[PDB]
Amino acid sequence: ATCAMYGNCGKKSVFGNELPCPVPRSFEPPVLSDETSKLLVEVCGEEWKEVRYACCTKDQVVALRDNLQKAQPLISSCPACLKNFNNLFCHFTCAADQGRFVNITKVEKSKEDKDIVAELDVFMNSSWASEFYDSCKNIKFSATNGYAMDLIGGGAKNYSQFLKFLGDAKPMLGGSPFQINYKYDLANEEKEWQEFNDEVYACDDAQYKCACSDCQESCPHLKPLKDGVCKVGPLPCFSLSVLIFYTICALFAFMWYYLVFESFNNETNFFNGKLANLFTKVGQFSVENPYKILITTVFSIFVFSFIIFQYATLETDPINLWVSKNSEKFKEKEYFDDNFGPFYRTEQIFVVNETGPVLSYETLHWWFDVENFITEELQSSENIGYQDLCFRPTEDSTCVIESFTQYFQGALPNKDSWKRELQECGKFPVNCLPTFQQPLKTNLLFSDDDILNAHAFVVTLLLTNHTQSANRWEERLEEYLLDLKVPEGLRISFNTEISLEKELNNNNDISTVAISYLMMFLYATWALRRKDGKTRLLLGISGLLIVLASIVCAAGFLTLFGLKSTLIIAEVIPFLILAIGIDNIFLITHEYDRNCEQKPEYSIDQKIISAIGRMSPSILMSLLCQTGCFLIAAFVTMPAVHNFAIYSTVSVIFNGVLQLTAYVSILSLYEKRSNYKQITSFLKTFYFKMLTQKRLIIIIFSAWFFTSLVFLPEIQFGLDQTLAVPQDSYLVDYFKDVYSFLNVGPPVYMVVKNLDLTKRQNQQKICGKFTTCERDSLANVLEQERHRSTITEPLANWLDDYFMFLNPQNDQCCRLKKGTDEVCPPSFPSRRCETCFQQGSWNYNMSGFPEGKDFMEYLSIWINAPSDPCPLGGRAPYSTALVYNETSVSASVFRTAHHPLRSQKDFIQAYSDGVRISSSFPELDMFAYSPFYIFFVQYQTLGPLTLKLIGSAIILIFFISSVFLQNIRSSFLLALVVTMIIVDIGALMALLGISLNAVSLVNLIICVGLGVEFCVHIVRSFTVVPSETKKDANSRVLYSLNTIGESVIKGITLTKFIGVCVLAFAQSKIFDVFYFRMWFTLIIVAALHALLFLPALLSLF
């Protein structure tokens, strides 16, 4: 055939490889000999079997073979890439029709006085080259963790750049002895020179499959798109749905513009009758025996009061009061703790120079003198320094101190060039390895990657000691940083492990609790003052003592069962019971007071029973409504607020019993002792005149409800940390510092359980660096989630490292004494030990990889490798990432990490990313564990839950009210207004700035309970009226507001207003945001609906 190159004619110059000898195209080389053909087929491939007029010689082919092994090990990972290299070079020399696409631009005279090619030109197009570049575009150099394109192609980004390096003449570097140029353009209208072409193989090519890490095409691009989770259009989807609903409703209204209860009442009527008889029975006993009942109450308080002091008055800690012990995210933590040890105990310290760079020699000199002090010679009260508690990657290794000081091995740098040294270490961490041999990324050590201009740098200390000794040192560290003096202009914010626990139980704001009672006491006397003008001080005091006695009795009774109340939640209860407890006091006394001027025939004792009997149903409903709502709220599994419901349910039942059996007896004596003479409009006539505009009132409020109904989807989620801890604390500074001066997120450990990892089938679902690994393997899937999910850090796959550790290429990694299975000790420097796997036994397609028993035999060697000579030694990094018993690997951990997570919207989102991915592997028995997952487990289903609980409460009210009221058309109206209030509160919940948590969920669940109190009294009076009042609706509602309106304004509304008004002045910001705003807004809204909407609504019921 036409050969443009055949044979060699000596070296161009001294110490130079022999160059090819140019020959004319017409010249016909001799047919390939048997000896030559044998080498060509094996070196290049089977395609050269049939070639006859090959343009190569024995010395020419071997020369190419010698140089191929220079690069073959560097691209052997991708079989497709390897094939292309061989074909390009093999056809570049031995192609039969070489002259078709090969031209010799220039020639030179060799030392042997023989012409030798100096410049070579080859004709192709940008199709073979373009595909060839694509195949090796993404190949990764595992050893350096960088692209092999950097070395082989000089980091070429385009095919021209890559092939330019290949065609460059670098004989000294082993490159092409003579310059080679590529001619992509080839017109050849005369059909003289034909273009270069052959069979290309991409990474995805089935025959020559390639791993995902070496090419994206073979990687699981089949990612099911996830979307439609936020909204549609510029507004929430729900809002649009409701808005269109109104429009269609208006159209129906526009179209129309042109134009048994009594059967069951028999049992229900008798049901209330039996209720009155029983209640009247209690009244007579409690009034006729004001000593046997009063005395036992005092004694009962002592028994419960003593129990609190003696048996238990304890509290809890964050993990025991914000995460349920039955949730999956907690049962998974216990598994992780038992096997892979509890997570470390961080001590992050931030050094901040807001408004300027922080890194200066005086600052660096100052810090180095205190970082060493903390981690070397601090010592707790028991003399246990950091070195006795630090985290050591192995038996012997310097303590892990993730700080920028470790770049200099902990020694002060010289002032002459300290700036330059740090920049180089930060840019290339591997060079400046710390004392414990672990590179420190600049993101984990500075606020940004510029370092020099960084505003703050982080200093993380890790403790692997989980005994009480570690707690004492942390207390010493906290007391050492608070009293530490910093240079002018800086600022230190830190957080030990015990800081949060110590700071939640530190806002002893009990002072405000006393004031609220005292403020309520002042009002209580005024509210209960005799209509004549006399003030009954004893009744007001007796009312408060009953409330306090209920809490004391409730705590004692529940202390026996072992419940513990947190300090933060133990301060709300006094406010809550005061708000609701005193509410019944005014009614019972007010009804008796009304009976003072009427029915004068009855004596003091007789009148009392009448008041109790008359109000028996109204009060009882306020109890069943104030007890069912709390019990409903107990369905929240967070122990801090689950105990809040239970501690409040018993603090109202006991109060209810006390107010019916104890307080009445006090009234039996105080009134009897007084024996007052028989007791015989402004700002009121104006009322009931504004209510004449019934139709207008409904329109305004109905518009308010519908408007508030579209803003619900804007309610935020999450409980901010800075609220929980007291203000003016050292944790609020830290939390504001993590959200701004941190660049590394929490780690996530993708635990895997009950996997053989000794069978080729199972090993293929984890590996992600070998061609035959399953596409949907763990390493492969997580690789793609990096660009789509919150888990965006490289996976520390131990299995991949274990296999590569056996690579015969790395002779220093796996070594065995010849003829024996004993691992060759590192001391032996001679060639008395061979690699564990022979050259022909280790292939990238996992051909002869360890299997069955062999897998565990070599796992012991890898896990115990020194790691010093071979960087892939797994002892240091994966010492505690495996759980094995020399027969199988019980469990393993693949570490990853999220991105900084600069808010509570990221914390919730990050949690679902760890739960979604862990559910994408139906075969693997896997779960993802990050330290913060347990705390954010409620937000996964808080949306559906807050509708079931609040929705279930409203249905409950419609049922108990229906029985007690006996009038369905009235109970439904009551439920329609309570649900109206909640939706309005839900909208204002978003506007004000409150979030939806377990704390806010229970507050909103008990809002219906409070909301029913305002409205139930009006409905009850309206439903049942004296014969004198007209049976028409308009007069009946007017009558009710004139008989019970006064009590509602004073007893029901103003009482709660004073109870919660003082709660605004609270040291802890959690009380103000969640307990005050929610309850203060409820009173305003409920006081409007109950007193302006419910009257108007009932008029035209």
Ligand SMILES: CCCCCCCCCCCCCCCCCCCC(=O)O[C@H](COC(=O)CCCCCCCCCCCCCC)COP(=O)(O)OCCN
């Ligand atoms: C006669 C007695 C029996 C009557 C029948 C039962 C009545 C039950 C009424 C329940 C009222 C619930 C009020 C909840 C207020 C707080 C809501 C907080 C936010 C919330 O639930 O989630 C957002 C919106 O939810 C949503 O889906 C928003 C819609 C919530 C319901 C809207 C009001 C329902 C009707 C009220 C009147 C009933 C009259 C009864 C006479 C989520 O937002 P996202 O979708 O972006 O988040 C997707 C991720 N989770």
Ligand SMILES: CC(C)[C@@H](C)/C=C\[C@@H](C)[C@H]1CC[C@H]2C3=CC=C4C[C@@H](O)CC[C@]4(C)[C@H]3CC[C@]12C
């Ligand atoms: C510096 C090296 C390590 C970089 C470039 C990577 C791979 C090297 C080994 C590759 C890249 C291009 C290759 C190359 C270019 C061209 C020729 C001319 C041909 O007639 C014989 C093979 C030969 C001589 C090979 C030898 C191996 C080379 C030089």
Ligand SMILES: CC(C)[C@@H](C)/C=C\[C@@H](C)[C@H]1CC[C@H]2C3=CC=C4C[C@@H](O)CC[C@]4(C)[C@H]3CC[C@]12C
């Ligand atoms: C009912 C009260 C006692 C609750 C709301 C107050 C505080 C505790 C129980 C809870 C509420 C929110 C929790 C919380 C919020 C967010 C974070 C950030 C995360 O990276 C670590 C856990 C951490 C730091 C935890 C710690 C425990 C907290 C602060």
Ligand SMILES: *[C@@H]1O[C@H](CO)[C@@H](O[C@@H]2O[C@H](CO)[C@@H](O)[C@H](O)[C@H]2NC(C)=O)[C@H](O)[C@H]1NC(C)=O
């Ligand atoms: C914090 O950063 C500033 C910014 O350079 C350091 O220097 C100050 O720079 C501002 C702005 O030029 C000047 O107004 C101050 O007078 C500088 N103060 C100095 C030089 O002490 C500052 O030193 C840094 N704080 C430290 C190192 O503690």
Ligand SMILES: *[C@@H]1O[C@H](CO)[C@@H](O[C@@H]2O[C@H](CO)[C@@H](O)[C@H](O)[C@H]2NC(C)=O)[C@H](O)[C@H]1NC(C)=O
């Ligand atoms: C955590 O640190 C403590 C304190 O050093 C260790 O407790 C010591 O254990 C040794 C056992 O040889 C005793 O001799 C000491 O008296 C203990 N000291 C104290 C203060 O109790 C504990 O062993 C460490 N735990 C771990 C898991 O390393």
Ligand SMILES: *[C@@H]1O[C@H](CO)[C@@H](O[C@@H]2O[C@H](CO)[C@@H](O)[C@H](O)[C@H]2NC(C)=O)[C@H](O)[C@H]1NC(C)=O
């Ligand atoms: C993985 O690749 C190796 C290497 O090719 C295969 O083992 C044999 O390799 C020799 C030399 O290349 C071939 O002549 C043999 O034909 C190969 N064996 C077979 C069965 O073809 C090994 O087979 C490959 N394994 C898989 C699963 O493809």
Ligand SMILES: *[C@@H]1O[C@H](CO)[C@@H](O[C@@H]2O[C@H](CO)[C@@H](O)[C@H](O)[C@H]2NC(C)=O)[C@H](O)[C@H]1NC(C)=O
């Ligand atoms: C080593 O530990 C593993 C734990 O992963 C044991 O796993 C066995 O797994 C099989 C298959 O699921 C079960 O039928 C066995 O009951 C498991 N063993 C036990 C003890 O539960 C494995 O058996 C252990 N082997 C040795 C020699 O201890």
